[PDB]
Amino acid sequence: AGSMKLLNIKINEFAVTANTEAGDELYLQLPHTPDSQHSINHEPLDDDDFVKEVQEICDEYFGKGDRTMARLSYAGGQAYDSYTEEDGVYTTNTGDQFVEHSYADYYNVEVYCKADLV
């Protein structure tokens, strides 16, 4: 944890990048699963509480009130504006499709897989 501010947030298909008031550079493979490899500056980051606090801030930012929008944004690599769901397939405002990830029930994390051809 910390009382510093996240001065900068960016999103990729591969990770969420963050820059803090203290000057640190987070590189976080969101959502957080056992598969995630996070980086603080350019050394590995193993503080799961720190990663989950930044992930709560990111869920608030990218998904607005709906976290699901944040998880779809992580899966898609871009900050989406809205989404709709039908029969388990989630379509964002840009037309991108997603399904629940195979690991969602086992990790007990809300993760999504980009399903282009579903």
Resolution value (Å, 1 decimal)? 3.0
Q: Which residues are paired to 113 by β-bridges? A: 99
For 16, the token pair is 């969420």
Separation of CA 35 from chain center: 13
Using the CB atoms, write b or e for 71-97: b if 16+ within 10 Å.
bbbbbbeeebeebeeeeeebbbeeebb
Q: How far is CA 92 from CA 8, 60, 103, in A?
A: 24, 18, 21
- Maximum Cα–Cα distance across the chain: 44
Beta-carbon contacts of residue 61 (< 8 Å; ≥ 6 apart): 9, 70
| 3-state secondary structure at position 61 | helix
